[PDB]
């Protein structure tokens, strides 16, 4: 696996960039290494980007970057899971906060997560 972190500005959007012109030589090399005359067998190229439009189109076409995975901003249902990923039942929990749950830490944490989500998405 070859991971190109920050692929959004990776080597250019070809034919763009006033300050730098390294694109015309760096982009074709990568375009020829992947899906060239001789092709790789078991190599996976993974890129992460914040600006999809800023990546050159010739590399985004199928055969070079096949599977396009989009991550969206979480909704309430995803926010509940994300909060559960951090508010584990191992944190020091206040006794007065467990008073209304009779010591049931998991249920208390679930209710706190629900209240937090409701407040944040009100």
């Amino acid at each position: 696996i070859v991971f190109f972190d920050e692929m959004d500005s990776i080597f250019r959007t070809r034919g763009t960039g006033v300050s730098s012109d390294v694109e015309t030589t760096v982009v074709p090399q990568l375009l020829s290494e992947i899906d060239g005359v001789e092709g790789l067998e078991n190599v996976i190229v993974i890129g992460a980007s914040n600006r999809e439009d800023m990546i050159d189109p010739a590399i985004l076409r199928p055969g070079r970057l096949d599977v396009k995975i989009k991550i969206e901003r979480p909704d309430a249902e995803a926010a509940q899971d994300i909060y559960s990923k951090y508010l584990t039942e191992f944190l020091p929990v206040h006794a007065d906060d467990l008073a209304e749950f009779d010591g049931d830490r998991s249920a208390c944490i679930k209710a706190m997560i629900e209240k937090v989500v409701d407040r944040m998405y009100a």
Binding site: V18, S19, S20, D21, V22
Partner: peptide, 17 residues
């Protein structure tokens, strides 16, 4: 306001043994 790329010019060097 522009960027440049360098091409080197090698200098002669010779040593014995």
């Amino acid at each position: 306001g522009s960027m440049a790329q360098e091409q080197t010019k090698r200098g002669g060097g010779g040593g014995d043994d």
